[PDB]
Amino acid sequence: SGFRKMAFPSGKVEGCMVQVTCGTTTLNGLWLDDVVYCPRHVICTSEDMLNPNYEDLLIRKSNHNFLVQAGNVQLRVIGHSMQNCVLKLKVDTANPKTPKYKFVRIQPGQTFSVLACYNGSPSGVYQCAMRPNFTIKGSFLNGSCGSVGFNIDYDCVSFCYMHHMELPTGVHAGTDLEGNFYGPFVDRQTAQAAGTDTTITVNVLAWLYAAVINGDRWFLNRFTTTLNDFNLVAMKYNYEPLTQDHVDILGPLSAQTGIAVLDMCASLKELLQNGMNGRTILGSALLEDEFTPFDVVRQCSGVT
Amino acid sequence: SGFRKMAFPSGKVEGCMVQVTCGTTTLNGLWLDDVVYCPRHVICTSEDMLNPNYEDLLIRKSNHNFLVQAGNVQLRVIGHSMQNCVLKLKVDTANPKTPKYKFVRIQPGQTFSVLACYNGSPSGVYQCAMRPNFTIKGSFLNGSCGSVGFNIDYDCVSFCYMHHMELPTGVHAGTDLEGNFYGPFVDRQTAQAAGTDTTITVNVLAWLYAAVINGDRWFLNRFTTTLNDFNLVAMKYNYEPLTQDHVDILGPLSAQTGIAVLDMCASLKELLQNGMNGRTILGSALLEDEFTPFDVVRQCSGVT
Numbered sequence: 001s002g003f004r005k006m007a008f009p010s011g012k013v014e015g016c017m018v019q020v021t022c023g024t025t026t027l028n029g030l031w032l033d034d035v036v037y038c039p040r041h042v043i044c045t046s047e048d049m050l051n052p053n054y055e056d057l058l059i060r061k062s063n064h065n066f067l068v069q070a071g072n073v074q075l076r077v078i079g080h081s082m083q084n085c086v087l088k089l090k091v092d093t094a095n096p097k098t099p100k101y102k103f104v105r106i107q108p109g110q111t112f113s114v115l116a117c118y119n120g121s122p123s124g125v126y127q128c129a130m131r132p133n134f135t136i137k138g139s140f141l142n143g144s145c146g147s148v149g150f151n152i153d154y155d156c157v158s159f160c161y162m163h164h165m166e167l168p169t170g171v172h173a174g175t176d177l178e179g180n181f182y183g184p185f186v187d188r189q190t191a192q193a194a195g196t197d198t199t200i201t202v203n204v205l206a207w208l209y210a211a212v213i214n215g216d217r218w219f220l221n222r223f224t225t226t227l228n229d230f231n232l233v234a235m236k237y238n239y240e241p242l243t244q245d246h247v248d249i250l251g252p253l254s255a256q257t258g259i260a261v262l263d264m265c266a267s268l269k270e271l272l273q274n275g276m277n278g279r280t281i282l283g284s285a286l287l288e289d290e291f292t293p294f295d296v297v298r299q300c301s302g303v304t
Numbered sequence: 305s306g307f308r309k310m311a312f313p314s315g316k317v318e319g320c321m322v323q324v325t326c327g328t329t330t331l332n333g334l335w336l337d338d339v340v341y342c343p344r345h346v347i348c349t350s351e352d353m354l355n356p357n358y359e360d361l362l363i364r365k366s367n368h369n370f371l372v373q374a375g376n377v378q379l380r381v382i383g384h385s386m387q388n389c390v391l392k393l394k395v396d397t398a399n400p401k402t403p404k405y406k407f408v409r410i411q412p413g414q415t416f417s418v419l420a421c422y423n424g425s426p427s428g429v430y431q432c433a434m435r436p437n438f439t440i441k442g443s444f445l446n447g448s449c450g451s452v453g454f455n456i457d458y459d460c461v462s463f464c465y466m467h468h469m470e471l472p473t474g475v476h477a478g479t480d481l482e483g484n485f486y487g488p489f490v491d492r493q494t495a496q497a498a499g500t501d502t503t504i505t506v507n508v509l510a511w512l513y514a515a516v517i518n519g520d521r522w523f524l525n526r527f528t529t530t531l532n533d534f535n536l537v538a539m540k541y542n543y544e545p546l547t548q549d550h551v552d553i554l555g556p557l558s559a560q561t562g563i564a565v566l567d568m569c570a571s572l573k574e575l576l577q578n579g580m581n582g583r584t585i586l587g588s589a590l591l592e593d594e595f596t597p598f599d600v601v602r603q604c605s606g607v608t
């Protein structure tokens with residue numbers, strides 16, 4: 001019993017973190033096999049950030065200009081290429097600690113763990129969600145660029161995020177491991193609109209099931225609703241519209257608890273319309289949307 | 305910018321986790337040097353749990369009865385001893401992945417990361433606080449016993465907690481690494497009173513400083529208070545009384561922000577008396593007490 005915002009064990013990712021320096025900028029790199037991946041803005045200076053011409057800046061760099069250090073040992077760079085917003089530094093040594101891994105592009109609403117790093121060293125790990133507007137609300141200071149987000153299925157690490165930018169609003173933006181930004185963002189020090197965000201409805205429902213499983217039941221009511229009626233409420237409260245695909249993914253939790261998905265929707269509807277009335281659910285005084293239905297099943301059954 | 309409930313990177317602890325089986329019970333062990341530490345209740349059966357005679361149960365066991373498996377390799381047990389509520393299994397091989405470590409007994413109100421494990425395998429990591437009443441609100445299912453809590457200062461892991469029990473209330477209890485329970489708890493399946501808990505005042509203040517540093521300032525007011533006046537409010541709201549030692553520990557945050565500790569206390573006083581009025585602070589709709597002043601300084605400065 002108990003339900004926590006759990007991150008994946010970060011060990012497999014810790015063994016991939018390196019420091020990448022180019023000129024006066026130092027940030028983090030991800031060393032997998034004989035390739036080090038890092039944000040391409042490692043090649044910029046202060047005068048560049050407003051609108052860097054990355055192609056031109058990269059042309060003035062050679063393999064020997066990229067200083068890559070794994071803990072205390074230096075890696076020899078034998079190639080460099082820019083793919084979208086990431087640099088790929090080919091090194092002469094394959095990382096002995098390379099885990100089984102994949103590069104995946106996550107969907108908005110999905111969750112992942114971030115290993116925050118500075119100068120190639122891990123500082124901490126936390127779980128978060130990719131917002132519906134493709135931003136993340138992380139904890140990143142200058143030097144954290146290149147820190148990655150990932151998920152782990154048994155022995156395979158699926159890398160889904162690499163940190164690149166802090167928007168003027170204090171929210172975070174980054175790319176998949178092929179250097180494609182999530183969202184409309186560009187890697188430049190410019191004010192950039194993040195779309196209107198919404199609350200991840202399917203995740204709040206998953207978390208309400210986690211609450212029932214762990215004893216927090218006060219919010220269960222005698223009502224039901226329909227997808228149409230619920231979606232009118234979700235519209236008013238800036239919640240993502242619920243679809244049958246979302247209901248289908250909540251199936252395991254509905255089956256375990258015996259509470260029909262539309263009945264749980266009616267509980268969520270009443271919580272949106274009436275608030276928590278000074279009460280809490282799983283130690284929170286707000287509706288938590290950072291747990292997917294998969295996260296709830298995994299945590300509630302002790303999957304390692 | 306941004307402030308998250310960050311756990312320490314768990315890699316150094318992951319390399320110490322082993323599976324310990326004795327009879328029909330399997331749980332987690334911590335392998336450091338040539339010693340495996342685990343809860344002594346691994347030697348119990350269902351009929352024992354109500355009030356196990358651990359000394360008698362342990363006398364019926366021999367070194368060969370403790371099955372210790374590190375991933376896929378079996379460890380040879382050459383000695384066994386019970387120290388308080390932990391078993392120490394001497395093995396013939398020192399853990400090659402033993403990090404620099406210490407065993408520490410944390411104080412109530414201090415925080416630490418837990419690496420939740422099942423069958424010797426890590427499932428996740430989360431940060432929590434040792435409650436003033438010596439319980440922890442974790443996420444532990446059957447099989448998680450032996451999972452540990454720790455802190456990391458550069459390369460040294462300070463192990464402070466080993467999980468033993470879930471109280472009938474769903475809160476968690478465990479020991480230091482010498483097997484001494486935190487709190488009044490005994491390792492038996494019996495209803496056991498946890499003392500009256502309180503909110504960790506110094507941590508809420510630290511978190512209010514973290515909020516100001518990251519832009520959440522709406523709760524700052526034109527008032528001040530005294531330790532005496534504040535402690536009358538803290539008494540009413542079941543907050544720990546604030547002492548000059550707590551004010552002294554908040555010094556770095558008071559100096560960084562320019563907000564005197566007693567001024568921040570006046571903000572906390574008004575939040576306790578008036579509530580949040582449907583607003584949030586660092587993504588929370590309640591007063592968070594799971595960040596120490598040290599955690600706030602570390603996270604706000606990117607210590608690795």
Ligand SMILES: Cc1ccncc1NC(=O)[C@@H]1CCC2(CC2)C1
Nearest residue numbers: 041140141142165166187188189
């Ligand atoms: C200073 C900082 C803090 C946290 N996270 C990231 C950063 N850095 C940035 O956002 C810079 C400015 C724009 C950029 C994309 C090209 C990199």
Ligand SMILES: Cc1ccncc1NC(=O)[C@@H]1CCC2(CC2)C1
Nearest residue numbers: 345444445446469470491492493
């Ligand atoms: C079933 C479970 C779940 C989570 N954490 C722990 C447990 N197990 C226990 O609490 C047992 C019963 C009493 C005990 C101390 C001797 C071990």
